[PDB]
Design a protein around this ligand. Sequence first.
Ligand SMILES: *[C@@H]1O[C@H](CO)[C@@H](O[C@@H]2O[C@H](CO)[C@@H](O)[C@H](O)[C@H]2NC(C)=O)[C@H](O)[C@H]1NC(C)=O
Ligand SMILES: *[C@@H]1O[C@H](CO)[C@@H](O[C@@H]2O[C@H](CO)[C@@H](O)[C@H](O)[C@H]2NC(C)=O)[C@H](O)[C@H]1NC(C)=O
Lengths: 49, 49
Amino acid sequence: KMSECVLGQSKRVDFCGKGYHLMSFPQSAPHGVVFLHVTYVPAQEKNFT
Amino acid sequence: KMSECVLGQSKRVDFCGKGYHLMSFPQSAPHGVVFLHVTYVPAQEKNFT
Ligand SMILES: *[C@@H]1O[C@H](CO)[C@@H](O[C@@H]2O[C@H](CO)[C@@H](O)[C@H](O)[C@H]2NC(C)=O)[C@H](O)[C@H]1NC(C)=O
Ligand SMILES: *[C@@H]1O[C@H](CO)[C@@H](O[C@@H]2O[C@H](CO)[C@@H](O)[C@H](O)[C@H]2NC(C)=O)[C@H](O)[C@H]1NC(C)=O
């Protein structure tokens, strides 16, 4: 995830958060790592022919 | 990796070597496999407005 979510933009569904992946920022934790996933989510659909 | 690095071109970051993946060639090793990763690396940048 560090390489594919933070050092690039992924197309893998659900791999880098929910929505269309834009970017990620790492944060450190005591024995691990926390990823902040930024995604694009569409809203307010309308009907068309 | 045999499927995704050798039988195709991957966009996965750092999965098929360092740089932009072009192609890979397998070699047999005793009890293992060796991947020769061919990558594209840019060089000699200039700055512009
Ligand atoms: C697009 O049109 C359809 C109907 O063709 C709308 O469907 C409605 O759906 C609600 C539930 O969400 C039902 O209670 C209504 O009875 C439906 N209407 C009809 C006329 O069947 C749908 O809501 C429309 N989509 C948008 C985004 O407005
Ligand atoms: C593009 O311009 C930037 C400055 O805007 C260059 O960075 C400077 O590089 C010199 C030489 O290494 C350093 O002494 C300066 O401290 C740098 N400035 C800053 C603000 O970091 C950069 O090297 C230029 N790129 C190229 C290819 O020439």
